[PDB]
Amino acid sequence: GSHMDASKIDQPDLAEVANASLDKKQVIGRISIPSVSLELPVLKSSTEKNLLSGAATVKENQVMGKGNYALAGHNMSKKGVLFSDIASLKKGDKIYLYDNENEYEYAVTGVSEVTPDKWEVVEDHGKDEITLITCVSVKDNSKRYVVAGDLVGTKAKK
Numbered sequence: 001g002s003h004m005d006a007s008k009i010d011q012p013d014l015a016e017v018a019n020a021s022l023d024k025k026q027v028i029g030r031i032s033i034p035s036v037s038l039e040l041p042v043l044k045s046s047t048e049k050n051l052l053s054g055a056a057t058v059k060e061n062q063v064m065g066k067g068n069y070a071l072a073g074h075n076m077s078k079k080g081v082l083f084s085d086i087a088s089l090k091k092g093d094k095i096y097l098y099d100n101e102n103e104y105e106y107a108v109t110g111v112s113e114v115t116p117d118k119w120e121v122v123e124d125h126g127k128d129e130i131t132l133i134t135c136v137s138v139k140d141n142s143k144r145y146v147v148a149g150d151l152v153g154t155k156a157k158k
Contacts, residue, residue: 001119007135009048011076022053029064030098031055031071036085042098046072051135055082058122058133064099065154067124068131075134075144086132087111087145095130095149098157105153106130113143121146 022041029042031054040054050056051074058070073083089095095106114121122131128151137144 004116007072007116009051009074009135011074011136012048012052017052020049020052022050026050028057029100032096032098033089033093034096035089035093036079038082038085040073040082042071048135051082064097064102065104065128065151067127068122068129069097070122070131070133072133072135075137077138083132083134086134086147089132089147093149097130101157103155103157104151105155106149107152108147108149111145111147114146116140116144121148127151 024041026043026045027041028044030040031042032039043050043054043056044060044062046056046058051072055071055073058072062069073086074081076082076084078084089108089111091108091110093108095108097104097106112121122133130149130151132147132149134144
């Protein structure tokens with residue numbers, strides 16, 4: 001994955017996150033996860049700054065409802081923060097994702113921990129699947145928590 005130095009976000013201080021501004025102009029969808037009571041905007045531009053206010057997509061030419069939709073968030077390990085409790089998601093957990101003007105119903109199929117070099121979990125397999133991960137967790141050497149889910153349905157955003 002490039003120079004692997006892309007995810008060099010490093011658990012930033014709340015001061016940087018609190019002061020960090022968000023360009024709603026970079027919003028292309030939304031992510032809702034009742035399981036943790038998490039509601040956030042989906043930012044296409046994956047930047048260290050953008051990740052401070054919401055969940056950013058990992059790839060560029062990603063499409064909701066098509067292929068493996070990879071979403072990256074913070075692992076600050078603090079309930080209430082972004083992706084701060086993804087490993088709490090149980091199999092069959094309802095994940096509501098929003099696209100252009102569409103609402104996608106995603107269900108968790110299984111949670112697991114994989115090294116950061118195993119991007120196969122974030123890469124497209126050949127179906128409508130969803131993958132939730134984090135830019136950085138604990139330590140580089142340490143591992144990370146990843147949640148995988150499958151597409152259960154789709155509808156229009158009101």
